[PDB]
């Protein structure tokens, strides 16, 4: 209720990312143009509208391997998967179009909105 | 040179608590005598020294049912489980001893520290 620990959510995310690094309790591999990325389905559901919609179905929820569209940039996905587990992203001239496209595909509204703003600032 | 999303970690935790409420992707039941609590082992590992220590062993990491000491106050546990998933605690005269004892059992050092400070101010 009234007492909050201000670093708690960030510490939880840090520890979740450590479990990912160690391959502890990971339950899915995402495949993007023949590159593989291990993850926790709970984190994917909590961060992406696409994964949320897919994994609410019990059948697709049980899948151990999930393929993304073969036109998705794996580095864009890598960037966004690391964002899920850290809250941080490098948004720069050389990657903004791939990140925005990938964030649109994953239904990550706040990243999309930020990308939009950054693109509009450069006309 | 990174960009940070200030609400991300709190939003992730909110959505994980939503998944717990809906019993989505929960992989353990924590038993305290006759009371039962469904949870995500990843969240347990990320917040409690006890759960981190036992779940480093693959054998215990695989358990679907975990029993706590039946002398544990189950509302004390419930308070602390909700804290893991929200960052928030109601700490007050009538519950502080039970919460403190439970936090010591669970090896939740920051909660124990804050309980200690609150108790000391009432001496």
């Amino acid at each position: 209720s009234q007492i909050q620990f201000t670093r708690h959510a960030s510490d939880v995310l840090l520890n979740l990312n450590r479990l990912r690094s160690r391959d502890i309790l990971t339950d899915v591999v995402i495949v993007v143009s023949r590159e593989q990325f291990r993850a926790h389905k709970t984190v994917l559901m909590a961060c992406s509208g696409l994964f949320y919609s897919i994994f609410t179905d019990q059948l697709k929820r049980n899948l151990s391997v999930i393929n993304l569209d073969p036109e998705i940039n794996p580095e864009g996905f890598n960037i966004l998967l690391d964002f899920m587990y850290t809250s941080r992203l490098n948004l720069r001239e050389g990657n903004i179009m791939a990140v925005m496209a990938t964030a649109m595909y994953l239904q990550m509204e706040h990243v999309v909105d930020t990308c939009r703003k950054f693109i509009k600032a450069s006309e | 040179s990174q960009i940070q999303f200030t609400r991300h970690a709190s939003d992730v935790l909110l959505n994980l608590n939503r998944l717990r409420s809906r019993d989505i992707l929960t992989d353990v039941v924590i038993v305290v005598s006759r009371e039962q609590f469904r949870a995500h082992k990843t969240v347990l590992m990320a917040c409690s020294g006890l759960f981190y220590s036992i779940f480093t062993d693959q054998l215990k990491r695989n358990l679907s049912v975990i029993n706590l000491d039946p002398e544990i106050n189950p509302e004390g546990f419930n308070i602390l489980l909700d804290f893991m998933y929200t960052s928030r605690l109601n700490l007050r005269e009538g519950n502080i001893m039970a919460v403190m004892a439970t936090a010591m059992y669970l090896q939740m050092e920051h909660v124990v520290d804050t309980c200690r400070k609150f108790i000391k101010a009432s001496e």
């Binding site: 209720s1 007492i3 909050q4 620990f5 | -």
Partner: peptide
Amino acid sequence: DWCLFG
């Protein structure tokens, strides 16, 4: 640390 949720 801890703070008031508010």
